[PDB]
Amino acid sequence: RWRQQWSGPGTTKRFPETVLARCVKYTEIHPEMRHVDCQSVWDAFKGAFISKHPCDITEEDYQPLMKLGTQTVPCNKILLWSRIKDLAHQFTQVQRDMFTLEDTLLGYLADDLTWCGEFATSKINYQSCPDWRKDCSNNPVSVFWKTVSRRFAEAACDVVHVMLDGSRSKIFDKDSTFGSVEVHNLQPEKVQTLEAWVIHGEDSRDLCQDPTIKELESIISKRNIQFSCKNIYRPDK
Amino acid sequence: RWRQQWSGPGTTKRFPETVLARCVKYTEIHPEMRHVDCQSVWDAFKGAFISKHPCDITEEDYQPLMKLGTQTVPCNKILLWSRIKDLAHQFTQVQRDMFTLEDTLLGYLADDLTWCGEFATSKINYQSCPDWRKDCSNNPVSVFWKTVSRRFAEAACDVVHVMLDGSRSKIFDKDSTFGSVEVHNLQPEKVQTLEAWVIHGEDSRDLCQDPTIKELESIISKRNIQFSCKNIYRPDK
Ligand SMILES: COCCO[C@H]1CC[C@H](Nc2cc(=O)n(C)c3ccc(-c4c[n+]([C@@H]5O[C@H](COP(=O)(O)OP(=O)(O)OC[C@H]6O[C@@H](n7cnc8c(N)ncnc87)[C@H](O)[C@@H]6O)[C@@H](O)[C@H]5O)cs4)cc23)CC1
Numbered sequence: 080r081w082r083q084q085w086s087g088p089g090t091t092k093r094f095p096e097t098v099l100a101r102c103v104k105y106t107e108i109h110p111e112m113r114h115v116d117c118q119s120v121w122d123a124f125k126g127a128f129i130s131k132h133p134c135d136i137t138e139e140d141y142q143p144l145m146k147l148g149t150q151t152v153p154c155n156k157i158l159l160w161s162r163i164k165d166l167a168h169q170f171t172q173v174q175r176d177m178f179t180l181e182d183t184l185l186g187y188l189a190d191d192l193t194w195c196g197e198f199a200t201s202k203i204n205y206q207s208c209p210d211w212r213k214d215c216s217n218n219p220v221s222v223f224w225k226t227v228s229r230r231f232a233e234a235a236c237d238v239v240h241v242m243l244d245g246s247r248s249k250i251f252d253k254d255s256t257f258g259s260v261e262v263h264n265l266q267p268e269k270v271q272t273l274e275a276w277v278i279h280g281e282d283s284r285d286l287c288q289d290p291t292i293k294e295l296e297s298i299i300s301k302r303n304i305q306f307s308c309k310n311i312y313r314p315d316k
Numbered sequence: 317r318w319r320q321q322w323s324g325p326g327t328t329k330r331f332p333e334t335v336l337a338r339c340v341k342y343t344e345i346h347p348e349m350r351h352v353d354c355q356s357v358w359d360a361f362k363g364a365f366i367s368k369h370p371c372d373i374t375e376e377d378y379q380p381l382m383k384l385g386t387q388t389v390p391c392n393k394i395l396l397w398s399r400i401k402d403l404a405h406q407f408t409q410v411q412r413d414m415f416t417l418e419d420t421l422l423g424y425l426a427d428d429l430t431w432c433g434e435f436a437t438s439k440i441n442y443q444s445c446p447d448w449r450k451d452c453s454n455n456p457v458s459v460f461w462k463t464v465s466r467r468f469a470e471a472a473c474d475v476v477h478v479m480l481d482g483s484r485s486k487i488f489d490k491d492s493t494f495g496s497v498e499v500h501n502l503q504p505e506k507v508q509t510l511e512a513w514v515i516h517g518e519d520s521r522d523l524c525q526d527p528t529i530k531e532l533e534s535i536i537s538k539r540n541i542q543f544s545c546k547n548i549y550r551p552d553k
């Protein structure tokens with residue numbers, strides 16, 4: 080390998096223009112967030128990773144951006160999800176009431192983008208960016224999602240819902256973002272119940288009996304939060 | 317996390333003095349290598365990782381050191397090993413004929429040490445060093461062993477022996493240094509046979525029938541190298 084050769088795709092083409100345009104469009108769907116200066120938002124985003132080594136990013140790097148993208152969503156209307164992105168977002172696009180992280184400004188900005196800096200320059204690396212597994216874990220994208228997913232989980236309250244893919248071999252994966260960051264940052268003072276919606280892909284079983292679901296229950300119970308689980312048998316309906 | 321916070325142990329206490337002393341002692345066990353200037357060897361070693369980000373090390377970083385530690389060992393007398401370090405080295409300490417990588421100068425120098433640089437300084441990081449899995453793969457230690465193990469495998473010829481731990485659940489592990497670097501760098505022009513010695517830990521089975529051993533055979537066969545396997549039932553004897 081050569082210096083700064085990473086295994087992952089490079090920064091999304093036209094990433095600066097895309098983030099700015101997404102901030103502009105979000106400010107229009109959500110009159111609550113028109114107080115946001117989108118050029119300031121982008122500057123803070125760029126400042127989090129530019130000129131920094133893309134294997135050495137910190138949560139504090141994103142703190143200016145978290146401040147400018149601070150957004151109050153009803154803490155009792157949070158939808159977490161794991162490995163069922165399409166249905167989770169179609170669900171909140173109908174409800175319009177419930178919020179996934181991608182329905183917040185910061186999640187919307189970053190959704191499906193990749194980015195990283197060419198260290199020791201002020202330039203964006205369009206050639207490759209670190210892969211979390213093969214290259215390094217503290218890369219600009221992974222650190223961003225770890226930090227905003229933790230803050231999203233920390234803000235939830237009352238009954239927190241999580242949509243899970245029942246057609247998977249690991250319905251609950253302790254190593255996912257949900258299993259490794261979000262579930263452990265639910266605050267028992269604010270959160271009374273974690274309710275899992277296990278979406279079936281035809282499986283007549285009670286997937287709340289699945290061993291990974293029982294594993295999730297044990298994690299939740301040890302945090303002094305109650306657990307609830309429901310089968311959703313016909314995702315269509 | 318904070319900047320340069322790694323998950324692995326810091327550089328071995330007194331690492332510079334240890335590497336130098338080990339080079340001195342090796343030059344005395346092996347009159348063949350007294351042409352080696354140990355201060356030059358250490359300077360090259362230090363130069364490979366000092367002032368470089370410990371998540372961005374390259375094979376070329378170690379090329380000055382490889383040159384100064386060039387060592388000819390009989391290519392037909394190589395012993396590779398995986399997960400049976402103690403017996404493999406007791407074997408070559410008796411034989412004195414066969415060489416593991418730790419019996420070469422460079423392997424001897426680094427054996428059981430850890431090291432890394434504080435990036436943007438010329439100082440050694442004694443607090444922590446990247447863990448290959450949790451932090452980043454291209455760290456000074458992992459890159460060193462990947463590079464010297466590849467060159468060791470590239471130099472082998474005729475019948476190459478590999479000692480393996482038959483008491484393990486994965487007798488052959490495709491992800492080990494042996495499985496992922498060494499076996500794929502055996503040169504079919506030089507190497508006629510890879511012979512596995514599967515050491516038993518009381519298991520009367522033919523462990524050459526093990527599925528991971530058959531997996532190894534398939535890898536070796538696809539490289540146009542013959543395969544041989546032997547059970548060693550009484551490691552004591
Ligand atoms: C002891 O310390 C261990 C803690 O280390 C954490 C482990 C997770 C890691 N996060 C990401 C890393 C990453 O590199 N990229 C590109 C992401 C892109 C989008 C997102 C999003 C998260 N969320 C919220 O979290 C739940 C969904 O996320 P889930 O992971 O549960 O569901 P899944 O369908 O499996 O993933 C979806 C995408 O994310 C990628 N993905 C996941 N895991 C990855 C990993 N380990 N490596 C590389 N890709 C990873 C996957 O390839 C898919 O493109 C939801 O409730 C959201 O509220 C919405 S978007 C996350 C990442 C940060 C560091």
Ligand SMILES: COCCO[C@H]1CC[C@H](Nc2cc(=O)n(C)c3ccc(-c4c[n+]([C@@H]5O[C@H](COP(=O)(O)OP(=O)(O)OC[C@H]6O[C@@H](n7cnc8c(N)ncnc87)[C@H](O)[C@@H]6O)[C@@H](O)[C@H]5O)cs4)cc23)CC1
Binds near residue numbers: 395416449493497
């Ligand atoms: C698609 O690209 C994938 C290629 O990526 C490679 C994967 C392997 C990695 N190598 C090391 C990484 C490392 O961070 N450190 C501290 C090492 C220390 C000593 C050595 C030595 C190798 N050898 C020759 O190789 C065979 C034995 O080695 P084996 O691995 O087969 O047997 P095992 O008993 O399991 O390991 C023994 C020690 O090495 C550590 N160990 C292994 N694997 C590791 C890993 N992935 N992460 C972190 N520790 C790892 C393990 O914790 C034990 O302390 C022999 O025939 C030698 O000739 C003699 S010393 C290697 C490393 C380099 C990058």
